[PDB]
Amino acid sequence: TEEQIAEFKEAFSLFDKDGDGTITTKELGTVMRSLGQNPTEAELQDMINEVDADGNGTIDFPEFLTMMARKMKDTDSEEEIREAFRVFDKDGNGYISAAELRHVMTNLGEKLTDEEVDEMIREADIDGDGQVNYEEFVQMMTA
Amino acid sequence: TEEQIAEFKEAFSLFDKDGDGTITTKELGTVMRSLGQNPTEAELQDMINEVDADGNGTIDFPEFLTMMARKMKDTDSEEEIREAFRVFDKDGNGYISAAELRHVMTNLGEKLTDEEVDEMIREADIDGDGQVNYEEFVQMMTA
Amino acid sequence: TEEQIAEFKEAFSLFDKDGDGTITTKELGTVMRSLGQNPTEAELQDMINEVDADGNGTIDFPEFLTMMARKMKDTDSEEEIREAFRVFDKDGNGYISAAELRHVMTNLGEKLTDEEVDEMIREADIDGDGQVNYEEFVQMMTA
Amino acid sequence: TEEQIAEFKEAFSLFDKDGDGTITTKELGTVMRSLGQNPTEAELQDMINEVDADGNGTIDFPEFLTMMARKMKDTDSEEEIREAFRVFDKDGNGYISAAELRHVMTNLGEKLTDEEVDEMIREADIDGDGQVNYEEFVQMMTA
Amino acid sequence: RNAFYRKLQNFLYNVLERPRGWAFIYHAYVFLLVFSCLVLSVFSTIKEYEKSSEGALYILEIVTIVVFGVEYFVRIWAAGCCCRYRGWRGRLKFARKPFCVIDIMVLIASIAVLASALRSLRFLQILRMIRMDRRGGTWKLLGSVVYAHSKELVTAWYIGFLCLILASFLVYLAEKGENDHFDTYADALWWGLITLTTIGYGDKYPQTWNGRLLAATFTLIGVSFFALPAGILGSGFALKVQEQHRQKHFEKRRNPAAGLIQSAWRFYATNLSRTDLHSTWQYYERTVLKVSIRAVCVMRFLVSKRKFKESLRPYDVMDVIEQYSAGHLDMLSRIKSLQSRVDQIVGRGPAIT
Amino acid sequence: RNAFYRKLQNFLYNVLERPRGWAFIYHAYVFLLVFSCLVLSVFSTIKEYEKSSEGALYILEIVTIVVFGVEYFVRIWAAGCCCRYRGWRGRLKFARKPFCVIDIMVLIASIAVLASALRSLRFLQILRMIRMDRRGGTWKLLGSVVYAHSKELVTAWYIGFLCLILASFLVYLAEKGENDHFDTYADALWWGLITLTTIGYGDKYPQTWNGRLLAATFTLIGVSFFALPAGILGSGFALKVQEQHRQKHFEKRRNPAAGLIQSAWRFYATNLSRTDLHSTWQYYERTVLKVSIRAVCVMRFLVSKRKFKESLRPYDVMDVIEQYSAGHLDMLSRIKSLQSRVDQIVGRGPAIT
Amino acid sequence: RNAFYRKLQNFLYNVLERPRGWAFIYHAYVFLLVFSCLVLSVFSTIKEYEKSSEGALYILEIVTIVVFGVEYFVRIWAAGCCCRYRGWRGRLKFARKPFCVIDIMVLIASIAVLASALRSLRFLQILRMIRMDRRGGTWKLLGSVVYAHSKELVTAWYIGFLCLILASFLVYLAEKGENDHFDTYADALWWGLITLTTIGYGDKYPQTWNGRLLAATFTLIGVSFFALPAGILGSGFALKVQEQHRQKHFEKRRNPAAGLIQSAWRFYATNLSRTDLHSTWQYYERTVLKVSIRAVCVMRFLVSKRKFKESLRPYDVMDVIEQYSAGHLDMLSRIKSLQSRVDQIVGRGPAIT
Amino acid sequence: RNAFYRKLQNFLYNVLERPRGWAFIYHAYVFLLVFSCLVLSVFSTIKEYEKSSEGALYILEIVTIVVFGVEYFVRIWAAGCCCRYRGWRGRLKFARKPFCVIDIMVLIASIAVLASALRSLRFLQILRMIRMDRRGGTWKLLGSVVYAHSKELVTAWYIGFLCLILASFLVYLAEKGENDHFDTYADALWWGLITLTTIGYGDKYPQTWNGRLLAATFTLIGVSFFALPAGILGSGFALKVQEQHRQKHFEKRRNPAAGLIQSAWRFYATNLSRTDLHSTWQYYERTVLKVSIRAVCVMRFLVSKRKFKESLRPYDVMDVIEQYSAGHLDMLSRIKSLQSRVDQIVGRGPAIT
Ligand SMILES: C#CCn1nc(NC(=O)CC(C)(C)C)c2cccc(OC(F)F)c21
Ligand SMILES: C#CCn1nc(NC(=O)CC(C)(C)C)c2cccc(OC(F)F)c21
Numbered sequence A, B, C, D: 001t002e003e004q005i006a007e008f009k010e011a012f013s014l015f016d017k018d019g020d021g022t023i024t025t026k027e028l029g030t031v032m033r034s035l036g037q038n039p040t041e042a043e044l045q046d047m048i049n050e051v052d053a054d055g056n057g058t059i060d061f062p063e064f065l066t067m068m069a070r071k072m073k074d075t076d077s078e079e080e081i082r083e084a085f086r087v088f089d090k091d092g093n094g095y096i097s098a099a100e101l102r103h104v105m106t107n108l109g110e111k112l113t114d115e116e117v118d119e120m121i122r123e124a125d126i127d128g129d130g131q132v133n134y135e136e137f138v139q140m141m142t143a
Numbered sequence E, F, G, H: 001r002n003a004f005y006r007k008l009q010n011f012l013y014n015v016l017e018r019p020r021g022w023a024f025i026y027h028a029y030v031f032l033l034v035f036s037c038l039v040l041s042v043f044s045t046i047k048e049y050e051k052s053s054e055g056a057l058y059i060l061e062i063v064t065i066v067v068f069g070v071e072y073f074v075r076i077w078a079a080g081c082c083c084r085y086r087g088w089r090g091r092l093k094f095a096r097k098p099f100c101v102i103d104i105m106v107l108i109a110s111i112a113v114l115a116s117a118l119r120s121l122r123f124l125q126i127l128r129m130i131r132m133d134r135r136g137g138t139w140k141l142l143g144s145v146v147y148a149h150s151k152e153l154v155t156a157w158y159i160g161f162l163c164l165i166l167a168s169f170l171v172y173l174a175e176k177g178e179n180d181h182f183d184t185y186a187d188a189l190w191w192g193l194i195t196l197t198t199i200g201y202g203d204k205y206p207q208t209w210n211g212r213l214l215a216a217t218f219t220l221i222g223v224s225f226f227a228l229p230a231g232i233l234g235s236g237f238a239l240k241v242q243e244q245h246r247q248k249h250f251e252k253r254r255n256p257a258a259g260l261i262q263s264a265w266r267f268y269a270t271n272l273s274r275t276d277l278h279s280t281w282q283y284y285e286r287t288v289l290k291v292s293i294r295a296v297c298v299m300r301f302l303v304s305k306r307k308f309k310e311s312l313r314p315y316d317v318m319d320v321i322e323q324y325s326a327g328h329l330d331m332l333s334r335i336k337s338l339q340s341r342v343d344q345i346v347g348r349g350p351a352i353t
Helices: A002-015 A024-036 A041-049 A061-069 A078-086 A100-106 A113-125 A134-142 B002-015 B025-036 B040-048 B061-069 B078-086 B098-107 B114-124 B136-141 C002-015 C025-034 C041-049 C061-069 C078-086 C100-105 C114-124 C134-142 D002-015 D025-034 D040-048 D061-069 D078-086 D097-107 D113-126 D134-142 E002-014 E022-045 E050-078 E086-093 E100-116 E117-130 E139-149 E150-175 E186-194 E211-268 E278-287 E291-309 E317-352 F003-016 F022-045 F050-078 F087-094 F098-114 F115-128 F138-147 F150-173 F187-195 F209-268 F278-287 F290-311 F316-350 G003-016 G022-045 G050-078 G087-094 G098-114 G116-128 G137-148 G151-177 G184-198 G209-269 G278-287 G292-309 G317-352 H005-014 H022-045 H049-080 H089-096 H098-114 H117-130 H137-148 H151-176 H186-198 H209-268 H278-287 H291-313 H319-351
Strands: A023-025 A058-060 A096-097 A131-133 B022-024 B056-062 B095-097 B130-134 C022-024 C059-061 C095-097 C131-132 D022-024 D058-060 D095-097 D131-133
Touching: A002 A024, A002 A061, A002 H291, A023 A024, A023 G050, A023 G184, A024 A041, A041 H291, A058 A061, A061 D131, A061 H291, A078 H291, A078 H319, A096 A100, A096 H089, A100 A113, A100 A131, A100 H209, A113 H209, A113 H278, A131 A134, B002 B025, B002 B061, B022 B025, B025 H319, B056 B061, B061 G050, B078 E022, B078 F209, B078 F290, B078 F316, B095 B098, B095 H209, B098 B114, B098 B130, B098 F209, B114 B136, B114 F209, B114 F278, B130 B136, B130 F209, B130 G003, B136 D040, B136 H049, C002 C025, C002 E291, C022 C025, C022 E022, C022 E317, C025 C041, C025 C100, C041 E022, C041 E291, C059 C061, C061 E291, C078 C114, C078 C134, C078 E211, C078 E291, C078 E317, C078 G087, C095 C100, C100 C114, C100 C131, C100 E211, C100 F003, C114 E211, C114 E278, C131 G137, C134 D040, C134 E211, C134 F022, D002 D025, D002 D061, D002 G292, D002 H291, D022 D025, D025 D040, D025 F003, D040 G292, D040 H005, D058 D061, D058 E022, D061 G292, D078 D134, D078 G292, D078 G317, D097 D113, D097 D131, D097 G209, D113 D134, D113 F187, D113 G151, D113 G209, D131 D134, D134 E086, E002 E022, E002 E050, E022 E050, E050 E100, E086 G050, E100 E117, E117 G151, E139 G151, E150 E211, E150 F115, E186 E211, E186 F022, E186 G209, E211 E291, E211 F209, E211 G151, E211 G209, E211 H319, E278 E291, E317 F316, E317 G317, F003 F050, F022 F050, F022 F115, F022 H151, F050 F087, F050 F098, F050 H098, F138 F150, F138 F209, F150 F187, F150 F209, F150 H209, F187 F209, F187 H022, F209 F290, F209 H209, F278 F290, F316 H319, G003 G022, G003 G050, G022 G050, G022 G116, G050 G087, G050 G098, G098 G116, G116 G278, G116 H151, G137 G151, G137 G209, G137 H151, G151 G184, G184 G209, G209 G292, G209 H151, G209 H209, G278 G292, H005 H049, H022 H049, H022 H117, H022 H319, H049 H089, H049 H098, H098 H117, H137 H151, H151 H186, H186 H209, H209 H291, H278 H291
Parallel strands: none
Antiparallel strands: A023 A058, A096 A131, B022 B056, B095 B130, C022 C059, C095 C131, D022 D058, D095 D131
């Protein structure tokens, strides 16, 4: 609604230092650098190019607000997350152990913080058994 | 109904110059030549042979009227058009970009006119975003 | 019912000349020879062995009556007949032409009589178009 | 309920001679040896390790009671038993003969007792025909 | 007397033409005979064993010629069974095929010789050996494999030919004067061929060291490229025979499919309670109690379904893929029908509410 | 006069460039001519047949040179049809390609020779032979296969080279003094190469018995490893050509897909009862009765659907797998919709009850 | 004393017969011994090393003969464990197998020799070497591969034989008088064989130029065709071993399937609350607390399900295709049931409305 | 100064160890250098070119030794980056690997020589050549292929060895007295090996005619069987490399899967309207406006989903089979749920009616 649109104005003003109404690749890289992470220029370019609807090399505000309002349900990425969990259940029994999960993640890709995995188990290990099903994880995540 | 059958009489009289009640391969080729396109004899023969129900080498009037009344829904070609669009979405995300579409078509097969693709986007780019889903395209087309 | 069971008695008396209550392989072969066809001994043995429920080498009366009462619906052979028609539709359009059918059958396997295929088209070419769908054929046959 | 929990206490007291509240691998092996069968140490270890929820090398009482209360329906092993029967129906007709079954089992794996297969046919050969369907077997078993 | 004679004629057509199993055993024995005749002729070429080889070869050649005569007699006699070649005029028509032409040419040459002759005899032996196929199956398979893999084979031939020419020329330059083997470029080409084929007779080999280095490099490359075609052809042979087996399996499918359709229609037109089934009923009557006819028709339908299911074996991944994908489309149609019926339910829902 | 001349130019571009079928027959004939010229040159190298070979080769060389001249003339003349190479300036631009560079280099060398020459003539023959490809297809396939199987080929090369070096050294030690063949380690390396390649000239072979045992062991190992590369390359050739055929099949799919989309949109925009279809209607009008236009558009749609379905043939297991898995996802979406609609039904159930 | 002795007998039957892993290590060591005996015999054939080879071979032969004697003793002793060969009469019955016949023939020949002998000793060595298999696995695989690829192999043999005969004859004509190598057609056949096999001894090679051209053409063709069979056989070997592995995997499936059925029925007949389960209850009682029996039965069912699922691994595309297509048919039946139930709903709809 | 030095150390560890692309170019250049050193040593063995070869080889050997020294220095210097080998003590620990042991052995031998030497130099060259791998990849692949196809290879070895022994013995009997080549059975074995390998030196060949016939039969059989192993090994190489590529592809899947899970959980724990997400919020805070953090997290989730879908490519039929069969089981569960819900509907139906 209107207040969400105003918050989007605030976010863009934080992003678009130039004030042209479009967050450029270089501006996005610099602001992200200021946000506490160090990506690469080609990474940013490729990850924003397909994100941009019109392929202008930047994100105009309508795309920004549409993607912010874009809910997880619309993406229909439930199958994607289900597969991502599936490629870790080598046994194939449908459940994935949690000490296993912790270690695998602490070491994999964007290494998560210890508190991050702690809250992961908090929300996902509702049963508190360690052997957590991933289908339920994705179903609650999408909801 | 009766008026449609009369219009079919008009169409056949336009086609069947001989007046034998059957549009022959040679007559079809000549009339089409008069209609502003230049096909080939073998092309016409093969494309009408399977079209003919009785395989008489020509189309009798009952077949003509049945095929004219044959709606797109009956063909159930929704899967065919869906696949034809699918073989162009190399990414496989389920959406096909429209500048892409324009160019691909202007250059592919029966090269469409610029106004043809313009009305294509008019009817299909209802969202007016360029990245048009093809499943919705086929679903509206069949309807 | 009772009258059907009596007709089964008549059929068995026609078959079982010995009167042992079981139609033997040799008795079946001889009676069939008397019925106007000339099969082979191994053919009969193999085709009755799996037919026999208890594998006694003959068919006792309960099996006879059960198989006679066994309707086509119970066999659930709709898929089998559908495939058998399918292996003849080389185009794969879902319809099989009838002149084609006539010839193919007059020449294939248990060569059918001309009147046999005539009544085949009578019952199956209800549309009377020659290009008969096989799914409808199997669906009406099973019913 | 409470009485079932008391029976679980009785079972554990029969099992856990040490009284530590956990049935150890060695204790399980010794008690089983006392129960009239002779397994192997590695067999026991592997078969209890995945059975244990926390991977402690033993089964604590909550796991014991949960697995005892764990019904066959929850396992959803209907597909597993259906396949196990399926790999024996070489014909693939969907029915498996019972003399066949008897012999195959008397000779296969954990060789069943004659009375065991007798009660198997009693419960499963309700039709009393020998050629027993396996889908019905699994469906009644799970129920 | 009449049916038995026709049955024997058909059996001898089976054995004389496209033999199977035992017929193939007879053909193997006659091939053995002719091959022993050829081997004894080769032995008779030698001077040391000429006398004994001729003594033991005269009788074998007589046996071979009489066997060939009787075999041709039976071939033309049994050619009459086929409808296309029925009658004596049809039998004569049968002889216009290319292989019958080859056989008659060989026969006329042999009778002319029987009525400086060693060369002609050897050529006749080669031609009669070529006659052993009678179906062109080996040549057909070879040609199909070569055409199918024409790209790979042509690439191998082009690269190997370039390597042969270049290596031969460079080694010729390296050894034109030093080595007597390579006094001409034709000698160098002969050496290059014999080397890249890995035959390596040893009559010609480089002796200079620049020549030996060039030979080493180009022999590595060229032996690889010359060995290529053989492997390409082997893989093509395997693939083509697999395709032929697949096609045969699908034809073996097609036949029982017609059988099943026939028997199913017979059952549909033989229901005892039903009526207007005069064709099938009268059909059974002429082949020749109605209940018995119905029972036999049901039995035929059951056995035909068994045969069709037997022929429906996978034999391949793509086969089952297509088989079950037909059912997948059927299930998609079913679920679309369920969707439409639920649409009817929701449309009617306001009516009840 | 004008359209006919352009059509002939395009046909001669087709034959002169990337020939198909009959064009390939013409290219085969010209290759035959040049190969006969090379063979006659080789024969003229020999002293015995020099006179007759030269007499019969002069005319053939004249024919070859005139054919080459006219072929280059036609090549540059037909290079103008392509838009990228339209105009005489575009024709000149077309000559900057590497193969045109090679052809012009060969032409300048040949004219320089025409205006100690046997070596240059042989080199020119080799270069003109290399000119026969004009697409790089053979070399491209070879390079792609080598790179694709780089691991296996490098393993074979490394193991075989180690085996060659070790075997040569050990046999040299075994036979340094006893055998005159192996008086140097370079001789031993030459023997090892000739043996492991299985060429076996026979100029060098072990004669001691320790040498013979070492030779036996290492020749087993090394002949296996040297035969490896040839089989690896053959398998790679087969696989790469199969991949190329798959890609060609998928492109042949892509084209009729565009055709089907075009014709389907035309039909959607040609409905007689419909309106606001001015573009397609006016389109047909300019190409050039409305009912006739609708009928032809429907006919085009039907034939285009037929063509698209024809192109949709499996050609492979993975192809049908993906095709039907798209429908499987569609059916999953449908069943999820059915689940949601049943949820609506159950939610409404309390309302009626 | 009794059970331990039977266990040792079974273990020695395992090692003596169809050895696995370590048993195969023992068999490899005994094969090594016999192979060293053969190599030392070959060395003793030479005159130079006869004395030392015999001195070191006497003891090795004594060791080999004593090992063979003890091995046969243990073989016949352990043949009694099998029920088919139980008892001493069963042990004697076991010796009627073809391989036992071969072993006893070798034993009688060896004892006769022990009780002009070098030829017999060499033949005995060859026979004892052939004895090493004892399963016929190698010969069975070779025969199965040859029969499976009989078409390709026969095509290769026929074409290669025609090429050999024709090339030999034509080169013989080309060089009958000019070359001393080809003074007879048998010499030409020997040359053709040695060339097309690419052995190329060099004792015979064409020296005329028409002969060399014929040799070149036909050696290209024939070396390709003679190399064919080897590749065909290699591919057949790979395929057949893959089929054998597939069959073994499916049997390893079959066993746990029976295990799972057994344990599932045991659980169904061991429910504590249930009754009329006397067979299984009494079964457990005799094997030997009811709750403990139920717990162990549930545990057995769980482990058996784990084992069955482990054995259910794909191992192949067609395997999973069939596995999931069974479920696809199950789902089709389910959706047909849903269709029928919706039909019931619509039929009842008028009743409520 | 500090981070740059560590980055350079890691880059030089990358190039010095398991080089990729350009690192492989540097390794190829150093291999070239050492191979040129070996070739120049071989040339220096010859007497004719000893002077020039030594003159041009001294400098190249100096270059090679200095390059080896600096390379070892950098290797031990960069071994410290790895945590397992951190510190100088960890660097020393790193040298206990078998390949470091081999390299140090070569280094001590080379320094001992530097501080009758041609044999030692050649052995050192062979060892340094063996040092080129450093991963055992070639040997690992060879061993895995041999073990995987152990059955086929052992069958080929057994049959070929029997054929070799039998053919050698029979030709020895045929030619013991007539031919000087076969005066001993060891000579016959040498001939049989050289023939069945198709090396065919020509030093020994049968000259009698019974010997030639035996040779022909057994050379057909044995050349086929000796060519078998090479094709078996080639097929095994191809298969094993394909399996390795499949495993690498699946690991490349596994990584983005973890990435996607991480980013999806981050998004779930970064919803602006949501609460109790302190960990992720504080996480972003420490890495470092809440709306900006949410936007970046959503963007990361989107890109991670893109990457995961990219990694989800089929690469194989079985891969997509399993992927879509998981969804097939999901759909079966869904349809079972629909069946249960329709059961609820029918049970409630009596309530409304
Ligand atoms: C490379 C190579 C050696 N090679 N092998 C050949 N035989 C075959 O491919 C098998 C057949 C198709 C002829 C039956 C052949 C044919 C023409 C030219 C060749 O080399 C040349 F290009 F140098 C040939
Ligand atoms: C048959 C054959 C010829 N052949 N080729 C062999 N080399 C290989 O298989 C490749 C390696 C695994 C040794 C790397 C070999 C090894 C032992 C015995 C042989 O023949 C013998 F059985 F007669 C061998």
